[PDB]
Design a protein around this ligand. Structure first.
Ligand SMILES: Cc1cc2nc3c(=O)[nH]c(=O)nc-3n(C[C@H](O)[C@H](O)[C@H](O)COP(=O)(O)OP(=O)(O)OC[C@H]3O[C@@H](n4cnc5c(N)ncnc54)[C@H](O)[C@@H]3O)c2cc1C
Ligand SMILES: Cc1cc2nc3c(=O)[nH]c(=O)nc-3n(C[C@H](O)[C@H](O)[C@H](O)COP(=O)(O)OP(=O)(O)OC[C@H]3O[C@@H](n4cnc5c(N)ncnc54)[C@H](O)[C@@H]3O)c2cc1C
Lengths: 649, 647, 93, 93
């Protein structure tokens, strides 16, 4: 294994993978090494089977495909709680473990990067380049000889069209494609990063890296290897890199570094959380912070690790009927249900229920002028200066999971759907900074969630809207009182839980179903197809109970960005318009860290694109032509370059 | 989008052909298909053939059908309000139907007495659409079209058993009873199923999904119920307005969205759907439109009228327990469902579930001796409709290798049912809206049995198919409960389950063989070498059958004729090219246009009207239809020549 | 008739097994009212056949309610004939 | 514990329990399971602390609305209509 290569890519997430594979493919002469903190992901059945993605977030002392960052300090804006932010700890990063929803950022998002080479128009070809789009649409804004497979999976779930009828009934329009770069207001069947033919998860490692390593010999893969720091020149030129074991499990925990040198380039693709930490402990970041830690300054870039941005997720859970198809029992570990789906996937993956994330519809939404007034001073102000003149930007995202996304240990029996919600461009802002030069120690962290009052109303408003959807669905059998806002029990807004009939089905032999004693829930009246339905009215106290419910239950969406921002240095930026870290030579960040502002999308698409854009930038610095298509992707069928149907088995 | 070229309202077979053909013909032609029901794409409760039966359940769960009930009790049905379901899902009937392959006869199309609709006019189009995947001794089938037609994965032993008994009773065997020339013979019955993939040949996947995968110009809107066609000053169809499928808006308000159409509006909402859209659009019966407060666009009293169908009867017979039937599957026996679901996934090319389990039948027609005992009023019909139309059968008959009946009203054990329908009924019904609102239930009347001619053929079929049941190897008896009310002492009275079959059902049962109650006359235990004679029938036996027809005759979902293609002064609604009278840029192309009936399960008929309808619009827009159509999803690459099964 | 009036008033009552009762004219207000859809669905909850109308084999009872005000069945001279016939057909030791 | 129970229960204590020392304020027991509707409980095992106020100050009534013996009577539990009852139950929690 080489002590010296041409390019080192630090962190094998989507961006790092795009970079590492595209360049090694661009030039068979160029020695490139991909260094990834977590384990190799290749042909791991707990990666490529999409329908098990949920477990990747278990904090259970076994799962190690994730690092969990906790707020160092408690937050008054989350009513005393310490926000928890995980991210990938595996080759492919997010792409190996994520929820696999295919979403794309609106056009302004990119234009609004205020950087040349990064306009929507600049990037559109690269958007198409990475896509193996395998589903219908009524536009030409998608790509069809790219590595990354996108489809509707093997099987959409009935509650998805249920959701769509309800959505229509409250005035969000149907659309063939909410990912056309154009849509802020509309409802679609949500696609997935899954190959409709193979039923496999379209992770970025098999697409860009494994592809190339199977046909060439200049792409090196070092897994289970935390990149401590970048090694610099007498003139801040990145000259190589040090890396350690993932596990600090040496004799008396003595630090064990291995230096591997870069003739030409060093890229950091270790994520919004990882990348800033490599800079700081390498001597690049806040000068006074580096000074307190004993790290020699190399470049004083205080914006390193600042401007932590995310999407803020709320999960509204609704009970549903027992003849509904949900994931809840599979999620509960019911052997013969798991046995059924595992078998179905191995036998015929082209149509298997496990060839899905079961998040099979949703919408990007935008409030009416009518609805603004119900929001507050602070958000209307944000609207005016950020959304008003930007009609392709959605305020909130809403989707249906065909199950309960939550701890089933804290959920009653029965089946649920959940309205998964995130705020698309929050005003609130966090940060992350090393506490030490040793790379095993936890850094200071502050997710930042809700430290701007403006972020409350749009979320509050999503709650109301996603509820009006739920109540209008055929599968609906009440709210889950336990996991909803703390309404006054005699507010017309207060929760209506499971009905007696759905209750009697769950436990037909139980001695307990329908015992009033405790008055713990107000039952729903049993389901009627013919029910005329009117909206929930909310009082001021109801809105406070919701605001308090947001503070308490608002969460990350793993759409982390902005910790090494691409803007001029003097505006607190960390990179050039070619992703060069200011004050350095031969060093680049390419991953979502470089984002100067947010994007209204699930950010796998975005990190792949930022990736492709880096491949270009680096390649045209090294006199290197990127090839299209990429090395054929393992297990995948030979694509055609143009739109086509599901093939023969 | 807000404006397209062609809007096709309703995505049944007919609507799928039109929308698909036209978008594939010219990729700059924008066409939107608005379908009141749910998208059916890649749904295993659609594409797997052997679960079709669930689709007719009124269990308050199943949402794939809309059920029409007679407004008023019919005297002719001894006081009962008839129920007539239709499909409420993309692909219409073709996404939930029984998947029985059957074609009308040559004289049926000729007898439209309409230019461009002769049999010789439509033979090319009948072939254009088929992907025939089974042997035959004729050249009347198409081999490069989108709709797959096969004998399924696996044929049931009872079909060949039926075929033998049918021989015993003088009905000859045929290679192909769907060769346009056959009114009287028996066959292995094909299916709208693809031999190789084991998948149901729905029209949406065949003609729409296919094109949506290779092109951008075909738009689909599901869960959208078309309220009304919008009209010009000069009665030019200009657009369409659709509503949510569920009336679930704030306080049940009416949220219409409008989509304009630069070139054409096609109503393909089916026999029950199209008249209502016309009616609330202002095309229909002037008086009705006046009362409901609708602006009259074209006074067409033919709209809603001359509803026609096939009249089903369902004769249920108890069979041996070693017989292979669908009953236990239909009951929801766990390891039986598990087995067949599994099997279908692993090898759909031979799976039991790659079948409708309706695996043999006949088209039949009475001899002169049979005519004599069918009374005057049929005999009249016969001389005026059948006598010199010799390719028209009177009755269809087929064996279901299981009980097509609520098993919650069925004793235990296995069954078969002789599924029967009257081919060309004289009886007529109608359908009319009772409000502008597209959610209020319409006035309706099946009209079944309101012409007395229709009794004799169905009586004849009951008796005849009983002779075929009695002579099978599987026959273990007749289910008294579900048969006519013969006198207990009449030779005609049912012989139910024998003591031996019974004992296998419940080997540890305590009541198997208790006479007490005399609820059945036991069959004798089966014998291979038993001589079997015709059941004799008296005048009172005969009355019992007419009673049973009146009590148990049903739709066959073969609904048509509510917008008859004939001259306006005859009660017409569309011209020879399916234009709606007194309007521009508006065509009915679905089964509504049929001015008379067809001796066939009407999926084949629906697709063919679709194809002819595509041709008509296509010549008007100066478009050339492409052959073959866009590749059908999941399907093997078809050669265009008769061929055998691939690895 | 007397025992039928007893049946109809029982908390357990969910209908009259039409197959094992007198041959009443379907329109007759005395005609049997068989199992209700809700009782059926419990029997074969995974079954594809429960609640299929086709055949018109039984007039389903309406679901059970403790409130139901109960009026006695009116029988015509016709109905009386059907019970007579049923008695001669099904009377025993 | 008295001191923290507020003025309105204290007055009742002075008048009803002060010198009636064989009278308990509260009852408490362990149900070796959840005495609640399990349809609204997570999975796992529970125990419940069953508590009741021994001598409430609060007062209800029941009154008929009709001669007919099948009609629901007027009713009011009267639960907690006397603030004295809150303190001891809070103390039990
Ligand atoms: C659970 C989850 C659900 C989400 N679901 C969706 C979805 O449904 N749809 C969607 O579009 N997006 C989703 N996302 C977001 C998307 O996956 C991420 O935004 C994306 O993966 C980030 O790409 P990245 O290259 O910027 O960094 P990352 O994907 O985070 O990759 C960083 C890599 O570097 C490694 N690393 C970190 N530090 C070091 C170090 N010091 N040395 C070496 N290696 C290091 C990590 O192991 C990781 O492989 C989700 C993410 C997660 C985790
Ligand atoms: C249960 C069943 C069993 C049958 N079995 C067989 C068989 O085995 N073999 C066979 O050949 N034929 C069978 N048939 C008959 C055959 O399927 C029909 O004749 C055929 O589908 C007719 O096609 P169509 O276009 O005329 O209308 P349909 O197929 O009935 O489709 C009409 C479409 O219009 C939609 N629609 C209606 N009103 C509106 C509105 N206002 N707005 C928007 N959309 C609307 C409906 O959702 C539906 O999708 C069966 C049908 C059913 C339903």
């Amino acid at each position: 294994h080489p002590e010296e290569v041409d390019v080192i890519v630090c962190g094998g997430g989507p961006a790092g993978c795009v970079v590492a594979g595209r360049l090694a493919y661009a030039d068979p002469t160029l020695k490139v090494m991909l260094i990834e903190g977590g384990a190799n992901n290749r042909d791991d059945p707990w990666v490529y089977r999409p329908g098990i993605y949920v477990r990747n977030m278990q904090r259970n002392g076994i799962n190690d495909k994730a690092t969990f960052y906790t707020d160092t300090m408690a937050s008054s804006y989350l009513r005393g709680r310490r926000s928890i932010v995980p991210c990938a700890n595996i080759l492919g990063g997010g792409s190996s473990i994520n929820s696999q929803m295919y979403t794309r950022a609106s056009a302004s998002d990119w234009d609004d990067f205020k950087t040349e080479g990064w306009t929507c128009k600049d990037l559109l070809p690269l958007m198409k380049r990475l896509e193996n789009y395998q589903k219908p649409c009524n536009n030409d804004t998608h790509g069809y000889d790219g590595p990354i497979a996108i489809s509707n999976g093997g099987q959409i779930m009935p509650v998805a069209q249920d959701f769509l009828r309800a959505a229509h009934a409250i005035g969000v329009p149907y659309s063939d494609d909410i990912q056309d770069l154009t849509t802020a207001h509309g409802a679609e069947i949500w696609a997935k990063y899954i190959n409709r033919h193979t039923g496999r998860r379209s992770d970025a490692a098999t697409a860009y890296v494994h592809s190339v390593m199977d046909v060439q010999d200049n792409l090196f893969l070092r897994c289970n290897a935390r990149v401590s720091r970048v090694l610099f020149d007498d003139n801040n030129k990145a000259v190589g890199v040090a890396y350690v074991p993932s596990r600090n499990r040496t004799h008396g925990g003595k630090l064990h570094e291995t230096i591997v040198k870069a003739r030409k380039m060093v890229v950091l693709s270790s994520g919004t959380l990882g990348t800033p930490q490599i800079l700081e402990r390498s001597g690049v970041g806040n000068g006074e912070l580096l000074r307190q830690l004993g790290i020699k300054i190399v470049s004083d870039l205080p914006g390193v690790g600042e401007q932590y941005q995310d999407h803020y997720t709320t999960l509204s859970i609704y009970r549903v009927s027992n003849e509904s198809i949900t994931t809840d029992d599979f999620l509960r570990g019911v052997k013969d249900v798991q046995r059924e789906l595992f078998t179905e996937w191995e036998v015929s993956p082209e149509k298997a229920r496990l060839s899905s994330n079961a998040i099979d519809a949703g919408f990007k939404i935008r409030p009416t002028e009518e609805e603004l007034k119900e929001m507050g001073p602070e958000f209307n102000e944000l609207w005016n200066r950020y959304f008003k003149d930007k009609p392709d930007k959605p305020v909130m995202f809403g989707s249906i999971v065909a199950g309960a996304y939550a701890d089933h240990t804290l959920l009653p029996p029965g089946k649920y759907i959940t309205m998964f919600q995130y705020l698309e461009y929050p005003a609130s802002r966090g940060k992350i900074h090393i506490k030490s030069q040793n790379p095993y120690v936890e850094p200071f962290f502050d997710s930042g969630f809700m430290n701007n009052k403006a972020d409350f109303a749009p979320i509050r408003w999503s709650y109301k809207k996603t509820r009006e959807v739920a109540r209008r669905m055929d599968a609906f059998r009440g709210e889950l009182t336990s996991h909803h806002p703390r309404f006054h029990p005699a507010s017309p807004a207060a929760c209506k839980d499971i009905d007696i009939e759905t209750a009697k089905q769950i436990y037909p032999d139980g001695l307990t179903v329908g015992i009033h004693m405790g008055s713990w829930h107000q039952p729903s009246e049993p389901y009627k197809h013919d029910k005329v339905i009117e909206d929930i009215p909310y009082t001021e106290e109801d809105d406070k109970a919701i605001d308090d419910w947001v503070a308490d239950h608002v969460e990350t969406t793993w759409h982390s960005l902005g910790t090494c921002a691409m803007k001029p240095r003097e505006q607190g930026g960390v990179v050039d318009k070619r992703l060069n870290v200011y004050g350095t030579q031969n060093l680049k960040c390419v991953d979502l860290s470089i984002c100067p502002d947010n994007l209204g999308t699930n950010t796998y698409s975005s990190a792949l694109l930022v990736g492709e854009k880096g491949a270009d930038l680096i390649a045209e610095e090294l006199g290197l032509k990127i090839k299209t298509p990429h090395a054929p992707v393992p297990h995948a069928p030979v694509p055609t370059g143009r739109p086509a149907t599901q093939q023969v088995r």
